[PDB]
Amino acid sequence: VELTEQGSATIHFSTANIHPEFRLQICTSYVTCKGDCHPPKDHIVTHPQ
Amino acid sequence: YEHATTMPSQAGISYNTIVNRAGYAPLPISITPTKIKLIPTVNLEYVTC
Amino acid sequence: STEELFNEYKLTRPYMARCIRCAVGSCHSPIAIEAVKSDGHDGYVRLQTSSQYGLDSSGNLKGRTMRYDMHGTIKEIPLHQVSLYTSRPCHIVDGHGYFLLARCPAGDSITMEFKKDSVRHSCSVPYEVKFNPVGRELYTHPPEHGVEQACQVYAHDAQNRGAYVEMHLPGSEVDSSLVSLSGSSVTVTPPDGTSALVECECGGTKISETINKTKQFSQCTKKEQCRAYRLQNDKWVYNSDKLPKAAGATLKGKLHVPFLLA
Amino acid sequence: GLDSSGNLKGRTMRYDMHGTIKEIPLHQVSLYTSRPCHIVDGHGYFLLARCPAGDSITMEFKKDSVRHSCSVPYEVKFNPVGRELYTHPPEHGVEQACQVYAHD
Amino acid sequence: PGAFGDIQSRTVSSSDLYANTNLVLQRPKAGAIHVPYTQAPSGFEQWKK
Amino acid sequence: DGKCTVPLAPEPMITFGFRSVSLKLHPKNPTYLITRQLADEPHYTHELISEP
Amino acid sequence: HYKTGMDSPAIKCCGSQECTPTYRPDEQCKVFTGVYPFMWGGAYCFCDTENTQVSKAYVMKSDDCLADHAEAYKAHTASVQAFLNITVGEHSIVTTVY
Amino acid sequence: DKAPSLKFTAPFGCEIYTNPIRAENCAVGSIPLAFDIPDALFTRVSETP
Ligand SMILES: *[C@@H]1O[C@H](CO)[C@@H](O)[C@H](O)[C@H]1NC(C)=O
Ligand SMILES: *[C@@H]1O[C@H](CO)[C@@H](O)[C@H](O)[C@H]1NC(C)=O
């Protein structure tokens, strides 16, 4: 990910956890990132998990 | 996705509702009844004059 | 008889359409079959063909005549010279417009044939033909006697019922026989008394339309280098999907469908 | 493919008749199965035709007033290409690899 | 598509027609002028069968 | 060897449910439906379908 | 029974086309690129590629829908009727009774 | 009586091809990778943000 002096960075991630909580590692830091996820629309998709 | 609601039968008054999926943008729904017609099945018996 | 044929044959132009199996391989047949309807009961089918029935190449009423387009020239044949068969030989009942009423057995395809000069023109299409018995006895060949029951059959009348098909302005049909070659120069000689749009791409682009007698386009070296589309656009044609479309407003009238189910 | 004398012709069948060799144009020669067949070409002893399915094959022609016919009980097969079982080749679809008796 | 009522008209003479037959256009064969399509077989004929 | 035109069956009508796919099939010719799971046991099915 | 109607393909040599909006029952339109149409009088376009063909289709009623059609009804509230000979005291009447 | 080919009856979603006879994209097993990376690509903590 590109990094600037000050700001916000967006990262796209895929999880199977309904209540995810992981330790995202960046250049040196170890951020603790948590939240809540919700079931998706599609019952069936055309790509593997 | 199946949604269900109950709009009172009153012409000229809008009915606004919202569909909230677990992790998706809310969907606004509006129903505006301009006329509600009740048409009985009538069969002619006779004619008088 | 003359009143039915007014819009059908005052403005007629039979066409040549692609056939997937024409006596050798696939080609452009004069009798290409567009549709076969076999929803009637006693083995009566109504074909729609690129050729036309009941008049001569000039456009005057004739008894039993199949009229077909051959490379731009409208020609004739008697209707008894044409053969039809699905799995066994069929028996043509009548013809009218683009449509032909025949009595056919059941089959997985239908084939139409005729020989005019020396070669055999044929067209076979994979349209399933069905034989539908009437009643609760599943015969295959109609009985000689029994009891009369109501049924729906393709009638032997060509009167104007409520069903119509569209006639459209024909698209320009390319003819490569017009483009001949004088010494290192293409030359377009359109058919006598008929125009030809010569779309010709070589050094300098050429869209010369209004040629009537003969023109020599010496800028272009070989015949295959450019095309000479044939323009008549006086007799209108059915809205076939096996023909090119003419630009602009194309609809020009309605053709009544004969031999309707009755 | 060529006449009684031994010279190349366009589409000609050459046949032996009681010791003397005769010729007839191929468009007078017909053959059929359950339904009529269509001759594509001929060469030497071999004839390439387009035939529907049938339990036998018959070959006929007519010379003066006698019809020469020969029927043999050799099964003729129609082999659809792909995974859709058709009896007559479709007017449109998708191109698939097949093997056919080439017209050469 | 493929079932009774795949095409629907309010009356015989009505100008409206609801059609749902999975009509799909396919690519034309090389060097051929025609419109290749694919659709479910008629539902009226199937119902009659 | 060469290329020949083979038909194209009507597109199946697919309905999705929780761990389920329902196929509605309307063939014009007897058409082959082949099926397999993408796992250690394919459990392949191979059917010929003529009627809807 | 339906009838799949369809317009004549619109072919453009060294050009491109656009789909007309659908206005007919089940109308589908597609512009197939890289076509080389080949009429009875030789090739149609002098243009190896970038030729376009517009093909569209739609559904109509069959020409025999006036006679060979099935009509769907909703039925309710049956109305019973009878045809009676009534004879009362040598007085007779044949009538329809609701 | 061939029965369907391997392209239709193979496990793990393998795709069978010929010339040469091969199976592609089998979703089975795991590839172990061994990396020998020169120190030139590595950057010190001071250089990186
Ligand atoms: C399963 O098949 C039945 C009929 O066999 C059908 O009614 C049902 O809808 C199918 N399942 C789903 C999820 O559609
Ligand atoms: C009832 O009416 C029918 C019709 O006229 C007649 O045939 C029948 O004999 C009548 N019965 C009596 C008992 O009158």
UniProtKB/Swiss-Prot annotation, chain A:
Localization terms from the record = Virion membrane; Host cell membrane
Post-translation changes? N-glycosylated.
| Superkingdom of origin | Viruses
What is its membrane topology?
A: Single-pass type I membrane protein
Subunit annotation: Interacts with spike glycoprotein E2. The precursor of protein E3/E2 and E1 form a heterodimer shortly after synthesis. Processing of the precursor of protein E3/E2 into E2 and E3 results in a heterodimer of the spike glycoproteins E2 and E1. Spike at virion surface are constituted of three E2-E1 heterodimers. After target cell attachment and endocytosis, E1 change conformation to form homotrimers. Interacts with 6K protein. Interacts (via fusion peptide loop) with host LDLRAD3 (via domain LDL-receptor class A 1); this interaction mediates viral entry to the host cell.
Q: What task does this protein carry out?
A: Class II viral fusion protein. Fusion activity is inactive as long as E1 is bound to E2 in mature virion. After virus attachment to cell receptor LDLRAD3 and endocytosis, acidification of the endosome induce dissociation of E1/E2 heterodimer and concomitant trimerization of the E1 subunits. This E1 trimer is fusion active, and promotes release of viral nucleocapsid in cytoplasm after endosome and viral membrane fusion. Efficient fusion requires the presence of cholesterol and sphingolipid in the target membrane.
For this entry, the protein name equals: Spike glycoprotein E1
Q: Which organism is it from?
A: Venezuelan equine encephalitis virus (strain TC-83)
| Segment of the intact protein contained | 1156 to 1204 of 1254
Curated annotation (Swiss-Prot), chain G:
Carbohydrate-modified residues: N85
Q: How is it modified after translation?
A: N-glycosylated.
- Cell location: Virion membrane; Host cell membrane
Disulfide connectivity for this sequence is: C13-C45, C14-C47, C19-C29
Give me the ranges of the annotated region E1 fusion peptide loop.
Answer: 35-52
Q: How does it sit in the membrane?
A: Single-pass type I membrane protein
**Assembly and binders:** Interacts with spike glycoprotein E2. The precursor of protein E3/E2 and E1 form a heterodimer shortly after synthesis. Processing of the precursor of protein E3/E2 into E2 and E3 results in a heterodimer of the spike glycoproteins E2 and E1. Spike at virion surface are constituted of three E2-E1 heterodimers. After target cell attachment and endocytosis, E1 change conformation to form homotrimers. Interacts with 6K protein. Interacts (via fusion peptide loop) with host LDLRAD3 (via domain LDL-receptor class A 1); this interaction mediates viral entry to the host cell.
Question: What is the annotated role of this protein in its UniProt record?
Answer: Class II viral fusion protein. Fusion activity is inactive as long as E1 is bound to E2 in mature virion. After virus attachment to cell receptor LDLRAD3 and endocytosis, acidification of the endosome induce dissociation of E1/E2 heterodimer and concomitant trimerization of the E1 subunits. This E1 trimer is fusion active, and promotes release of viral nucleocapsid in cytoplasm after endosome and viral membrane fusion. Efficient fusion requires the presence of cholesterol and sphingolipid in the target membrane.
Q: What is this protein called?
A: Spike glycoprotein E1
Its source organism is Venezuelan equine encephalitis virus (strain TC-83)
Q: Which residues of the full protein are shown?
A: 862 to 959 of 1254
